[PDB]
Structure formats: C-alpha cells, structure tokens
Enzyme design. Sequence first.
Site, mmCIF file in Angstrom:
data_model
loop_
_atom_site.group_PDB
_atom_site.id
_atom_site.type_symbol
_atom_site.label_atom_id
_atom_site.label_comp_id
_atom_site.label_asym_id
_atom_site.label_seq_id
_atom_site.Cartn_x
_atom_site.Cartn_y
_atom_site.Cartn_z
ATOM 1 N N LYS A 1 12.545 -0.261 8.275
ATOM 2 C CA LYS A 1 13.343 0.059 9.565
ATOM 3 C C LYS A 1 13.890 0.308 10.905
ATOM 4 O O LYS A 1 14.354 -0.155 11.457
ATOM 5 C CB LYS A 1 14.417 1.464 8.661
ATOM 6 C CG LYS A 1 14.331 1.243 7.164
ATOM 7 C CD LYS A 1 13.426 1.944 6.225
ATOM 8 C CE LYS A 1 13.557 2.183 5.332
ATOM 9 N NZ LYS A 1 12.801 2.830 3.721
ATOM 10 N N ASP B 1 6.484 12.243 4.071
ATOM 11 C CA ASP B 1 7.050 10.815 3.883
ATOM 12 C C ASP B 1 7.636 10.059 5.275
ATOM 13 O O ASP B 1 9.038 10.951 4.932
ATOM 14 C CB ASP B 1 7.423 10.260 2.893
ATOM 15 C CG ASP B 1 7.445 8.912 2.344
ATOM 16 O OD1 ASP B 1 6.863 8.377 3.484
ATOM 17 O OD2 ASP B 1 8.289 8.139 2.018
ATOM 18 N N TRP C 1 13.783 9.557 -3.263
ATOM 19 C CA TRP C 1 14.212 8.157 -3.423
ATOM 20 C C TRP C 1 12.897 8.496 -4.740
ATOM 21 O O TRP C 1 12.113 8.437 -4.973
ATOM 22 C CB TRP C 1 13.275 8.087 -2.174
ATOM 23 C CG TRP C 1 13.221 6.352 -2.051
ATOM 24 C CD1 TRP C 1 13.829 5.755 -2.041
ATOM 25 C CD2 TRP C 1 11.944 5.557 -1.801
ATOM 26 N NE1 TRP C 1 13.617 3.963 -2.097
ATOM 27 C CE2 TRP C 1 11.734 3.908 -1.965
ATOM 28 C CE3 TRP C 1 10.530 5.704 -1.793
ATOM 29 C CZ2 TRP C 1 10.878 3.342 -1.602
ATOM 30 C CZ3 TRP C 1 9.584 5.233 -1.574
ATOM 31 C CH2 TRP C 1 10.003 3.170 -1.258
HETATM 32 C C1 LIG Z 1 12.035 2.911 2.879
HETATM 33 C C2 LIG Z 1 11.729 4.355 2.100
HETATM 34 C C3 LIG Z 1 9.622 4.122 2.168
HETATM 35 C C4 LIG Z 1 8.697 2.289 2.317
HETATM 36 O O1 LIG Z 1 9.494 1.530 2.734
HETATM 37 P P1 LIG Z 1 9.250 0.265 2.756
HETATM 38 O O2 LIG Z 1 9.706 -0.514 3.023
HETATM 39 O O3 LIG Z 1 7.535 0.435 1.684
HETATM 40 O O4 LIG Z 1 7.950 1.193 3.884
HETATM 41 C C5 LIG Z 1 9.062 5.512 1.723
HETATM 42 N N1 LIG Z 1 9.928 6.722 1.769
HETATM 43 C C6 LIG Z 1 11.372 6.601 2.281
HETATM 44 C C7 LIG Z 1 12.375 8.425 2.380
HETATM 45 C C8 LIG Z 1 12.598 5.666 2.630
HETATM 46 O O5 LIG Z 1 12.811 5.735 3.091
#
Ligand SMILES: *Cc1c(COP(=O)(O)O)cnc(C)c1O
Lengths: 398, 398
Positions: free
Chosen positions: A246, A211, A130
Amino acid sequence: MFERIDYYAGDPILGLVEKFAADNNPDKVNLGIGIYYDESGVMPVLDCVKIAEQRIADPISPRPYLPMAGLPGHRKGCQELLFGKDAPVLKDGLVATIATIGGSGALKVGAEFIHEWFPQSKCYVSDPTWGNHIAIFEGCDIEVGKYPYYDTATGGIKFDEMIAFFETLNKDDVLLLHPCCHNPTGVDLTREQWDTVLNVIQERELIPFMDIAYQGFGEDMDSDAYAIRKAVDMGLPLFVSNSFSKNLSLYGERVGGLSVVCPTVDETERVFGQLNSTVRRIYSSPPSHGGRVVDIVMNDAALHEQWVGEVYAMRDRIKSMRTKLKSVLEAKISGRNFDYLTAQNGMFSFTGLTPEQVERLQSEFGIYMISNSRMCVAGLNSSNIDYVANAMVDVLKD
Amino acid sequence: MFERIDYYAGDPILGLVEKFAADNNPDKVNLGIGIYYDESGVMPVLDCVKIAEQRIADPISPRPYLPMAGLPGHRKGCQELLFGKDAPVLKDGLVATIATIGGSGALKVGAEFIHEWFPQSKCYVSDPTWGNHIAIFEGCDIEVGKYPYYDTATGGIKFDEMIAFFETLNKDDVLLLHPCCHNPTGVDLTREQWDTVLNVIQERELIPFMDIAYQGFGEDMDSDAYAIRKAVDMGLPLFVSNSFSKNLSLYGERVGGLSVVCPTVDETERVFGQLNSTVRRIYSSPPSHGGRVVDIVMNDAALHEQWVGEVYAMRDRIKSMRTKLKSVLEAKISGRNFDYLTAQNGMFSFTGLTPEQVERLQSEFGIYMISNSRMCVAGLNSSNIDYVANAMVDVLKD
Ligand SMILES: *Cc1c(COP(=O)(O)O)cnc(C)c1O
Ligand SMILES: *Cc1c(COP(=O)(O)O)cnc(C)c1O
C-alpha cells in the site's frame, strides 16, 4: 476424482473484485479492497517507484535467484523503517530479517516457523481482524482464537476485557497485533494503552506478532511504529510482518518483510538460518523486480524522502475524505453520530452497517463495502462523496 | 528465547552459492546450481525477455494485485506448453491452472492442497531426487518416502524394482515424477517405460505429480512433455508443476505454474477454487513483473518462436559440452567408462564421485559439484573443460 473438493465461496474482500468490475451500475463505487486511489479514482504510480523502475530497465540485467532472504538492501530498508535508522537493535545485530512475498508471505513464513519451533503455541487475533490472518495461521495447523477488541456499543476498544483475556494465556502463546491503522476497524490503541498491553505481554511471556501494512497512513512513519519500537525497548521476542503493497502502491510486485527480534547475536543467527530454511521449502527465494524497487527507493536518501512525502500526501487525502463525508452525513441525518469517521485511522472505517445494509448498498447502489461494514476511505473522492452519503442515508433509514 | 532453535546447516545446492563467490582459487569452476551459462560463463538475458521487459517499462503502469491465480495469459502459456496448443483437454475445460512462485511455489501449493483434501495420502520421491522435493512436502506435514530409481551399478533405472514398489502403494498415494531431464541424475525413462509406469499408476489409482523444470533442454518442447500428455490421454488425475526459471533464464522473477487435470468441468471448478483458496493463505497472489514477462512471451507467436529457438540453443550447447568432456576423459583415462556423460539428459550429469571426491574437487581445485556427485553441465565451456577433466582424473586416481 475430485467430487470430495468443496467449492470455494471466494474471499470476503477479493470475492468483490470481479463483482465490482462486472457491475453495470454507472454510479458504482468501490469501497471494498484496501487500495489507495487518488482524487480521480486512479491507482498512482509513485514517482520514486517510476525512477527506480527506469534504473532497473537500464540496463535490462541477468536475473539470478535472490538469496533466500532477499536483497540485503530490501532487508535493511524494512529494518530502518520499522526500528529506526541506525537503531540500537540493528547496531547490535539482534534482528533476523527476510524479504517476503508481501505482508501475506511474511505472515505465512512467521506462522510456519512458529508451527515448527513452537508447536504447542496457540495464536490469537483481534475481534475483528483481516480474515486472512486466520486463514494463514490455521493453514499452518496452528490453533487460532480471538481476543476481545472492538466494542460495537462504544466504537472503542474493550480494553479491560482484552487485558483480562491476555492474562489467561500461556507462555509462548502468540498475539497477532496491529501496531497502527487497525484492519478492519481503524480503531487503534493509544500509546498509554500500548505500554499497558506490552507490560502484560512481558509478564505473561507471550509472543507479540505485529503486522503492519499501512505505515505512514496513520500519523507519520515514526509514530505509526511506536508499538514496535516500544516492544523492542522492553526486550520482547517480537515478530514483525510489514508490507510495502500500500505505501509503495506496489500491490502486484509482492514486497514485504518479516523481522524477529532476538536477545543475542547467536539467537539471531539461529532464527535467521531457520527463516531461510522456511523460505526454501515454501517458494525458494523472493522476486527480483519488487526487491530491486524496495532496495533502490529505501536506500537512496533522495528517493526515500520523495517516497515519504508521497505517502503523507495519500495520508492527507484520506483524512480530507473522512472530514468531508462526516460533515455531509451529519447534515443529512440531524443529531446522529458520525465521529467514528474522523476518529478512525488509516485506510478503513468501520461503518457499523449490518450485512443486509451492506448487501443493499451493493445491489441497489453498486457501492461495495466488505460484509463486516468495512469501507475503504480512499475509494471516496469529490466525484462520489454525495452519492455515497445519500445511499448511506437511504440504507440507514430502517 | 530462541536457544531451542537449531542452526540451519544451509541447503546442499544453495549452501554452495556464497562459498563459490568467496573462493580465492583463480581457476574455480561452478558446476553446482542448475543455472544455464553461455560459452563465456555468463547468464544470458534472452532476447524475447528483453523485448517483453521493454514493453513492461513503456509505459510504467499502475500495479494492482494480480488474481490469486495469476494472469490469464500466464496460465494459458503454461497450459499450451505442457498440454499442447489447443489440446483437447484445454478445449474441454478440464485443467485447473494457476501461476506460481517458480516451480518451488507450485510444488508447495500442490502439497498444501494434497495435505488438506487427501490427508491420508503419502508422497514418494525418486531415489535420488532434488532435495527440496522432500523439504517442501514434509513441510506440509505429508509423510514422504522414496521409490527405487537410480541404479549405481548400471547407471540406469532400477525399472523392475520401481514398478514392484509402485504395486505396494495405496489408492491416492502421490508419486513425484520427473517427466524429463531428471534432477539430479539426468537418467530418464524411455517412452515405453513411461507407458508401463502410467499403466501401473492407473491400475493402482495413484496420483502422478509431474515436476518439470527443464522443458526444452531434453529433446524438444513436445518430446519433453511426452509423459504429461500420455497421462492426460489415459485419464489420470495428473498434477503438473512447471518452472520457467531455467528455460526463460528468469530464475529471480519466480515464474512457474501448477496444473491439475480433472475428469469433469465441475471438478475443474472445485479444484481451481481450492487452488485459489490455497494461494490466498500462503502469499495472496503472485508477482506482476514475472507474470507479465511470461504472458507477453508465451502469447506473442513471434516472441514464442524466438524463445523456443533460444532454449534449443542452450540445449545444443549443453550437448556439445557433454560430448567434449566425454572425449577428453576417455583419452585421459584409457578404457574406463564415461558413456553416462552423453547418455544423460538436461542440465545435469551424475558423475558417481564419492562425497570425499566431491569435497576434494572443491578444496583442491575450487570446482563445485553437489555432494551427491551432480554436476551442472552448463557450467562447462571451452575455457574450463581441460581444467575440470584434469581435476576429475586426479580425484578418480584412488
Ligand atoms: C494488506 C495487508 C497485509 C498483506 O498484504 P500484502 O498485499 O500481502 O502485502 C497484511 N496484514 C494486514 C493487516 C493488511 O491490511
Ligand atoms: C529448479 C527446479 C524446481 C523449482 O525451481 P524454481 O526456481 O522454484 O522454479 C522444481 N523442480 C525441479 C526438478 C527443479 O530442477
């Protein structure tokens, strides 16, 4: 005054949000941003959240600052989800946890802490990852590199190359790892691969920073946390950023956590204090409304059981779309391989389309994927799957 | 692993929150943190906010991410409050504004932008200032110094010394300025002093960064913004961080704004884009619930008029406490000077008590002031004013 300031090109994911909204093509499909939509293409309000928000609204209450670390029940909710209810590490008081501004804010606080206290550590992210992982850590003046991960030839992990890379690194270098539901590829390590990776990390004295943003969308809550719980059992200095965006369908309220696993209670106190200091100089304290939703849902056993069931329903719908799309594509292009659709896990599939093919899906069909070929499987439903499959066949024709 | 990590001593303001809660003294009084309490010592829920939150709860709605910049109505609410409804600068499209995570998050985004695009600029804060100003800017690897401000001898501003200091600075150095309601002293520049300061800032090509957190607690919304609107009229490259924490009694929902005033529309686009990029790599986007409250209250003329009246009621109560305490102290200690209580503005008074006297107020009386002598006037009411005055007389007796 500001002629020196570059235009911002916009983010590869978020730059598509306005574009999709503006698009006039009546058959447009959003497979870009990693949002869960239901079978009708609508973002759900989870029933557990609706009940918690009715509680927050009755009565409408004074709004003092939360602690710098957020609500204690939000912190505990994150800990039990990641480490397990009444896990030994929690009973022992060895985890420093704060509530954060989504997973993004957890990564930022973790990176700021690492830049301050480990100024000579470099961070390495998976190839690919990401993109905001790199933006957040570079934005803290940390040097960021990549470790080998996705193999375009096999659709698998370059496991041996990844291990060989880790063996070149310095004590206290940081690895940004995806414990499950890899973003963007959906290609995950096996348990045996995790055990091997974590052994190299232990031997080389590296810092694993996991993460996790789609816990429950892989296999189940406990299985998706395998790598986290294995790292704890091995005594590694684990950082974990988690997001509820999510899995609580609560993207806009900015709820996540950051946890650091420490060898002793005194080190937990040192690290927890410094996480508080770090929060104070970024945003002071996190938002009350999202914190209360997390606190109420995670700590009421009825709402928590309801929530788990709602996540597993989202998980199961995504799995149904993976199988439906694979069967349609396999029929439309005889003999060619789409096993990746059902082999990949979580919200995403990595389609392997070129940037030009992704551009053509957008311009010709109004179908939005990320330029790296990532597709959000939850954007698929009964109403658009044929249209998408037909478009993919057209663009693959080259 | 983490033996290298210092204990955090805790913040001088926020370190007192837990201490006050724990204190067993039945006559304890919280004059520390800058929170507005009503005549009964309770934090209000504003009626305008209660109406907005009933709207947000009916119906409970899906929760997509906000834009990186926050809601357009929140951004517009901040702009009209700071610059004036339909101000020429807004009609001309010359202000780049984002919603932020409170005033703290606005200062952090502004400092991150300054560190990236003006890496050779140093920042200067008033002597004294709210300590988190220094923590936020130093935390961005910006060098921070002080300019002379509060004169302990006169209880006034060392105006000539402050001007002489500004005349030593480099083009693009940043001054963190309090347009009204100075924190911690309550000692404010006159309009004539502002005109003089802003002329030096223009001549020396300095960047004024105004941080406003108690708009409406000084004189009135428009008067409190004088320095902001004067800087705009002069064509200065003004940054403004604003907070709604205190004036909306919404500390926990984390609502503020950051605005940058630009000479041209193209520069506004460059700066706005980079503010978005900066947000993306800190926390992605700001919280939905607080953003909707700001949007609803600021953009409904009825709720906005109600809100202004609620702020002016808080303003007037604080002014009543300043006069009551001054008259009691003047009677209890014949001939000695307490004019500062009614001369100072906003939430705070700077009592001039030593750190030892502040410690004794805490330990002997359970009366909590900040160690720099700052007292939160809103913590005073009919029920505690005599007790506080008597304690102050006791500690001043030296
Ligand atoms: C969505 C996502 C995040 C952070 O998303 P937030 O909306 O800031 O919670 C962090 N890491 C990964 C791999 C993601 O897919
Ligand atoms: C309160 C305050 C802020 C920021 O407060 P938030 O709660 O983060 O809005 C900024 N500056 C000053 C001078 C303040 O008093």
